[PDB]
Amino acid sequence: SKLEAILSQEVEAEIQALLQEAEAKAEAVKREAEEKAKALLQARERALEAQYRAALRRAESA
Amino acid sequence: EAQYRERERAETEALLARYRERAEAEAKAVREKAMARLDEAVALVLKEVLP
């Protein structure tokens, strides 16, 4: 029937909105985890490089 | 971290060995420079101590 198909289309629209919101939030989660793997890979690399440099400065001073 | 740790060990040892070698060379060089140049100054101190 007509309103039968209308209610079925409303259920399909709810499922569509649910899956689109799931895609958006999963993309945001993997994005922020990618930036935290990023910028953490920045911070510890710069810290260890500076530790290596300070060790070389102290060795040549000694 | 393992890579930069072993790089730190290798570079620090390889630089400190050259520092030890330059120290030994500098000490032997200043002794051999001072030894042949000696006996000029012993007359100076022996002349200025004595009245």
Short mmCIF file of all heavy atoms in Angstrom, two decimals, chain A residues 1-20:
data_model
loop_
_atom_site.label_atom_id
_atom_site.label_comp_id
_atom_site.label_asym_id
_atom_site.label_seq_id
_atom_site.Cartn_x
_atom_site.Cartn_y
_atom_site.Cartn_z
N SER A 1 0.82 -1.20 0.00
CA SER A 1 0.00 0.00 0.00
C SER A 1 0.86 1.26 0.00
O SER A 1 2.09 1.20 0.12
CB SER A 1 -0.94 0.01 1.21
OG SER A 1 -1.73 1.19 1.23
N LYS A 2 0.19 2.41 -0.12
CA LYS A 2 0.88 3.69 -0.26
C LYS A 2 1.59 4.08 1.04
O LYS A 2 2.81 4.25 1.07
CB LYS A 2 -0.11 4.77 -0.68
CG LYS A 2 0.52 6.13 -0.90
CD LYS A 2 1.45 6.13 -2.10
CE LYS A 2 2.08 7.49 -2.31
NZ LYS A 2 1.08 8.52 -2.68
N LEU A 3 0.83 4.20 2.13
CA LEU A 3 1.43 4.53 3.42
C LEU A 3 2.27 3.38 3.97
O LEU A 3 3.17 3.62 4.77
CB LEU A 3 0.32 4.92 4.40
CG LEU A 3 0.64 5.46 5.79
CD1 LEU A 3 1.52 6.70 5.68
CD2 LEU A 3 -0.67 5.82 6.44
N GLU A 4 1.98 2.15 3.54
CA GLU A 4 2.89 1.02 3.75
C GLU A 4 4.28 1.30 3.20
O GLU A 4 5.28 1.17 3.92
CB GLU A 4 2.29 -0.23 3.10
CG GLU A 4 3.19 -1.43 3.06
CD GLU A 4 2.53 -2.61 2.38
OE1 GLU A 4 1.35 -2.48 1.99
OE2 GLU A 4 3.19 -3.65 2.19
N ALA A 5 4.35 1.71 1.93
CA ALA A 5 5.64 2.06 1.33
C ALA A 5 6.23 3.32 1.95
O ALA A 5 7.46 3.45 2.02
CB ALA A 5 5.48 2.23 -0.18
N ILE A 6 5.39 4.24 2.42
CA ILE A 6 5.87 5.45 3.10
C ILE A 6 6.56 5.08 4.42
O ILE A 6 7.65 5.57 4.72
CB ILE A 6 4.72 6.45 3.32
CG1 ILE A 6 4.24 7.02 1.99
CG2 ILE A 6 5.13 7.58 4.26
CD1 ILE A 6 5.31 7.77 1.23
N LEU A 7 5.95 4.19 5.20
CA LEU A 7 6.55 3.76 6.46
C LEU A 7 7.80 2.92 6.23
O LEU A 7 8.78 3.04 6.98
CB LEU A 7 5.53 2.98 7.29
CG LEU A 7 4.36 3.79 7.85
CD1 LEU A 7 3.35 2.88 8.53
CD2 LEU A 7 4.86 4.85 8.82
N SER A 8 7.80 2.09 5.18
CA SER A 8 9.00 1.34 4.82
C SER A 8 10.13 2.27 4.40
O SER A 8 11.29 2.06 4.76
CB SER A 8 8.68 0.34 3.71
OG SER A 8 9.84 -0.37 3.32
N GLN A 9 9.80 3.34 3.67
CA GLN A 9 10.79 4.33 3.27
C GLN A 9 11.30 5.13 4.46
O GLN A 9 12.47 5.51 4.49
CB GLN A 9 10.20 5.24 2.19
CG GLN A 9 11.18 6.15 1.45
CD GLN A 9 11.47 7.45 2.18
OE1 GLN A 9 12.63 7.80 2.42
NE2 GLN A 9 10.42 8.18 2.53
N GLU A 10 10.44 5.38 5.45
CA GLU A 10 10.90 6.05 6.67
C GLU A 10 11.85 5.17 7.47
O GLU A 10 12.84 5.67 8.03
CB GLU A 10 9.70 6.47 7.52
CG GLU A 10 8.90 7.62 6.94
CD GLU A 10 7.67 7.94 7.77
OE1 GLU A 10 7.37 7.17 8.71
OE2 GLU A 10 7.00 8.95 7.47
N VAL A 11 11.58 3.86 7.52
CA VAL A 11 12.50 2.93 8.17
C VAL A 11 13.83 2.87 7.42
O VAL A 11 14.91 2.86 8.04
CB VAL A 11 11.83 1.55 8.31
CG1 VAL A 11 12.82 0.50 8.81
CG2 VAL A 11 10.67 1.65 9.28
N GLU A 12 13.78 2.87 6.08
CA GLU A 12 15.00 2.90 5.29
C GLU A 12 15.78 4.20 5.49
O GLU A 12 17.01 4.20 5.51
CB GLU A 12 14.68 2.71 3.80
CG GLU A 12 14.20 1.31 3.44
CD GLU A 12 15.29 0.27 3.59
OE1 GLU A 12 16.47 0.60 3.37
OE2 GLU A 12 14.96 -0.88 3.93
N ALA A 13 15.06 5.32 5.67
CA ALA A 13 15.72 6.59 5.93
C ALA A 13 16.38 6.62 7.30
O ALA A 13 17.46 7.20 7.47
CB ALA A 13 14.72 7.74 5.80
N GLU A 14 15.74 5.98 8.29
CA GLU A 14 16.36 5.87 9.61
C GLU A 14 17.61 5.01 9.57
O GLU A 14 18.63 5.36 10.19
CB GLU A 14 15.35 5.29 10.61
CG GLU A 14 14.22 6.22 10.97
CD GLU A 14 13.25 5.60 11.95
OE1 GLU A 14 13.40 4.40 12.24
OE2 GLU A 14 12.35 6.32 12.43
N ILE A 15 17.57 3.89 8.84
CA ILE A 15 18.74 3.03 8.69
C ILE A 15 19.85 3.77 7.94
O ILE A 15 21.04 3.66 8.29
CB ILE A 15 18.35 1.71 7.98
CG1 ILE A 15 17.38 0.91 8.85
CG2 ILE A 15 19.56 0.85 7.67
CD1 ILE A 15 16.74 -0.24 8.13
N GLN A 16 19.48 4.57 6.94
CA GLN A 16 20.45 5.34 6.17
C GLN A 16 21.12 6.41 7.02
O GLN A 16 22.34 6.57 6.96
CB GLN A 16 19.76 5.97 4.96
CG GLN A 16 20.69 6.75 4.05
CD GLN A 16 19.96 7.33 2.86
OE1 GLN A 16 18.75 7.19 2.73
NE2 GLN A 16 20.71 7.99 1.98
N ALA A 17 20.33 7.13 7.82
CA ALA A 17 20.89 8.13 8.72
C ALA A 17 21.78 7.49 9.78
O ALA A 17 22.84 8.04 10.13
CB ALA A 17 19.77 8.93 9.38
N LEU A 18 21.40 6.30 10.26
CA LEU A 18 22.20 5.58 11.25
C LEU A 18 23.55 5.17 10.67
O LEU A 18 24.59 5.38 11.30
CB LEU A 18 21.42 4.36 11.75
CG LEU A 18 21.91 3.52 12.94
CD1 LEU A 18 20.71 3.02 13.71
CD2 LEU A 18 22.76 2.33 12.50
N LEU A 19 23.55 4.62 9.45
CA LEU A 19 24.82 4.18 8.86
C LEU A 19 25.69 5.36 8.45
O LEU A 19 26.92 5.28 8.56
CB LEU A 19 24.56 3.24 7.68
CG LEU A 19 23.80 3.64 6.41
CD1 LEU A 19 24.70 4.22 5.32
CD2 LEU A 19 23.03 2.44 5.87
N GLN A 20 25.09 6.47 8.01
CA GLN A 20 25.88 7.66 7.69
C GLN A 20 26.51 8.27 8.93
O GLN A 20 27.68 8.69 8.89
CB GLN A 20 25.01 8.70 6.97
CG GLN A 20 24.67 8.34 5.54
CD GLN A 20 23.75 9.35 4.90
OE1 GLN A 20 23.28 10.28 5.55
NE2 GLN A 20 23.48 9.18 3.61
#
